[PDB]
Design an enzyme around this catalytic site. Structure first.
Site, mmCIF file in Angstrom:
data_model
loop_
_atom_site.group_PDB
_atom_site.id
_atom_site.type_symbol
_atom_site.label_atom_id
_atom_site.label_comp_id
_atom_site.label_asym_id
_atom_site.label_seq_id
_atom_site.Cartn_x
_atom_site.Cartn_y
_atom_site.Cartn_z
ATOM 1 N N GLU A 19 -3.234 -22.766 -16.926
ATOM 2 C CA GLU A 19 -3.377 -21.973 -15.713
ATOM 3 C C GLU A 19 -4.851 -21.758 -15.349
ATOM 4 O O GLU A 19 -5.217 -21.801 -14.183
ATOM 5 C CB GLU A 19 -2.705 -20.598 -15.854
ATOM 6 C CG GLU A 19 -1.183 -20.576 -15.807
ATOM 7 C CD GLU A 19 -0.599 -20.791 -14.404
ATOM 8 O OE1 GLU A 19 -1.345 -20.780 -13.399
ATOM 9 O OE2 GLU A 19 0.624 -20.969 -14.306
ATOM 10 N N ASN A 41 -4.404 -19.593 -2.040
ATOM 11 C CA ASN A 41 -3.341 -20.383 -1.424
ATOM 12 C C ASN A 41 -3.456 -20.160 0.083
ATOM 13 O O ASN A 41 -3.065 -19.113 0.592
ATOM 14 C CB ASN A 41 -1.973 -19.910 -1.923
ATOM 15 C CG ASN A 41 -0.819 -20.734 -1.360
ATOM 16 O OD1 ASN A 41 -0.804 -21.105 -0.193
ATOM 17 N ND2 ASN A 41 0.190 -20.966 -2.186
ATOM 18 N N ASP A 48 0.118 -19.432 2.052
ATOM 19 C CA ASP A 48 0.698 -18.093 2.061
ATOM 20 C C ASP A 48 -0.290 -16.948 2.062
ATOM 21 O O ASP A 48 0.102 -15.802 1.884
ATOM 22 C CB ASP A 48 1.710 -17.910 0.921
ATOM 23 C CG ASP A 48 1.065 -17.763 -0.446
ATOM 24 O OD1 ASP A 48 -0.175 -17.733 -0.578
ATOM 25 O OD2 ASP A 48 1.835 -17.677 -1.424
ATOM 26 N N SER A 81 -2.581 -15.812 -0.210
ATOM 27 C CA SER A 81 -2.620 -14.967 -1.391
ATOM 28 C C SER A 81 -3.534 -15.675 -2.397
ATOM 29 O O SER A 81 -3.784 -16.888 -2.279
ATOM 30 C CB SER A 81 -1.216 -14.772 -1.984
ATOM 31 O OG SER A 81 -0.734 -15.969 -2.573
ATOM 32 N N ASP A 141 -4.698 -16.145 -6.679
ATOM 33 C CA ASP A 141 -4.354 -16.012 -8.086
ATOM 34 C C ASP A 141 -5.667 -15.724 -8.811
ATOM 35 O O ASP A 141 -6.645 -16.460 -8.642
ATOM 36 C CB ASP A 141 -3.692 -17.284 -8.601
ATOM 37 C CG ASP A 141 -2.182 -17.225 -8.506
ATOM 38 O OD1 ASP A 141 -1.650 -16.243 -7.943
ATOM 39 O OD2 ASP A 141 -1.535 -18.167 -9.019
ATOM 40 N N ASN A 147 -0.992 -13.321 -9.247
ATOM 41 C CA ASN A 147 -0.931 -13.267 -7.783
ATOM 42 C C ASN A 147 -1.166 -11.917 -7.081
ATOM 43 O O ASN A 147 -0.547 -10.903 -7.402
ATOM 44 C CB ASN A 147 0.412 -13.876 -7.343
ATOM 45 C CG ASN A 147 0.484 -14.118 -5.864
ATOM 46 O OD1 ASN A 147 1.079 -13.344 -5.145
ATOM 47 N ND2 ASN A 147 -0.167 -15.175 -5.394
HETATM 48 C C1 LIG Z 1 3.733 -16.738 -8.571
HETATM 49 O O1 LIG Z 1 4.363 -16.624 -7.291
HETATM 50 C C2 LIG Z 1 5.773 -16.399 -7.417
HETATM 51 C C3 LIG Z 1 6.402 -16.507 -6.037
HETATM 52 O O2 LIG Z 1 6.533 -17.867 -5.646
HETATM 53 C C4 LIG Z 1 6.030 -15.072 -8.098
HETATM 54 O O3 LIG Z 1 7.450 -14.949 -8.313
HETATM 55 C C5 LIG Z 1 8.102 -13.907 -7.703
HETATM 56 O O4 LIG Z 1 7.670 -12.713 -8.343
HETATM 57 C C6 LIG Z 1 8.319 -11.553 -7.824
HETATM 58 C C7 LIG Z 1 7.592 -10.345 -8.380
HETATM 59 O O5 LIG Z 1 7.998 -9.160 -7.720
HETATM 60 C C8 LIG Z 1 9.806 -11.626 -8.168
HETATM 61 O O6 LIG Z 1 9.980 -11.744 -9.584
HETATM 62 C C9 LIG Z 1 10.389 -12.862 -7.467
HETATM 63 O O7 LIG Z 1 11.753 -13.018 -7.826
HETATM 64 C C10 LIG Z 1 9.604 -14.111 -7.872
HETATM 65 O O8 LIG Z 1 10.009 -15.207 -7.072
HETATM 66 C C11 LIG Z 1 5.339 -15.041 -9.454
HETATM 67 O O9 LIG Z 1 5.456 -13.746 -10.002
HETATM 68 C C12 LIG Z 1 3.868 -15.437 -9.350
HETATM 69 N N1 LIG Z 1 3.334 -15.621 -10.694
HETATM 70 C C13 LIG Z 1 2.217 -15.016 -11.093
HETATM 71 C C14 LIG Z 1 1.761 -15.246 -12.542
HETATM 72 O O10 LIG Z 1 1.590 -14.272 -10.356
#
Ligand SMILES: *[C@@H]1O[C@H](CO)[C@@H](O[C@@H]2O[C@H](CO)[C@H](O)[C@H](O)[C@H]2O)[C@H](O)[C@H]1NC(C)=O
Length: 130
Positions: A35, A46, A49, A51, A53, A60
Site C-alpha cells: 500500500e 483519486n 472520486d 478523495s 489516501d 481514505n
Molecule cells: C477504500 O475505499 C473503499 C470504498 O471503495 C472503502 O470501503 C468502504 O468503507 C466503508 C467505511 O464506512 C464501508 O465499510 C463500505 O461498505 C466500504 O465499501 C474502504 O474502507 C477504503 N479503504 C481504506 C483503507 O481506506
C-alpha cells in the site's frame, strides 16, 4: 519516515496488531508494503472520486479521517488526516484497527486483496524476531 522492514514489524507488534481480529503481523506487513512501501508520508489522490489516501496504511479521507476538502466525508476514526502523516504511527494503527472492525474487514485494503490474500506472506516477518 520510511520504516525498515523489521523495525516496522516490531512497532506493529508493540502496538497490538499481531492477531488483531485474527490477522497475523505478516499480513499487516504485506499490506503496508504494497500500500505504501512502509512510507508514512505516502499520499495518493483519486481525481475521480475526489478523495485522498494517507500514510503507511493508505487510509481514505471520505470514510475515516477528515482533511476538510473531501466531499461527503464521514470521519469514522475521529482523526485529522494529518495525524496519519506523522512519523509516530500510533494514530494510524488505532484507525487501522477501526477500519477492520467494519463488516468488510481487511478486504478494505485493495493491495491486500491483489498481493497478499491466499498467498504465503511469512517472508515479510522472517528474521525480525516477532
Ligand atoms: C477504500 O475505499 C473503499 C470504498 O471503495 C472503502 O470501503 C468502504 O468503507 C466503508 C467505511 O464506512 C464501508 O465499510 C463500505 O461498505 C466500504 O465499501 C474502504 O474502507 C477504503 N479503504 C481504506 C483503507 O481506506
Amino acid at each position: 519516515k520510511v520504516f525498515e522492514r523489521c523495525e516496522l514489524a516490531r512497532t506493529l507488534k508493540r502496538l497490538g496488531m499481531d492477531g488483531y481480529r485474527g490477522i497475523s503481523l505478516a499480513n499487516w506487513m504485506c499490506l503496508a508494503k504494497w500500500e505504501s512501501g512502509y512510507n508514512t508520508r505516502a499520499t495518493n489522490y483519486n481525481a475521480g472520486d475526489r478523495s485522498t489516501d494517507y500514510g503507511i496504511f493508505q487510509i481514505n479521507s471520505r470514510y475515516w479521517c477528515n482533511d476538510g476538502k473531501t466531499p461527503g466525508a464521514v470521519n469514522a476514526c475521529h482523526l485529522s488526516c494529518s495525524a496519519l502523516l506523522q512519523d509516530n504511527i500510533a494514530d494510524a494503527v488505532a484507525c487501522a484497527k477501526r477500519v477492520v472492525r467494519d463488516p468488510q474487514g481487511i478486504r478494505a485494503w485493495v493491495a491486500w486483496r491483489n498481493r497478499c490474500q491466499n498467498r504465503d506472506v511469512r517472508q515479510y516477518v522472517q528474521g525480525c524476531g516477532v
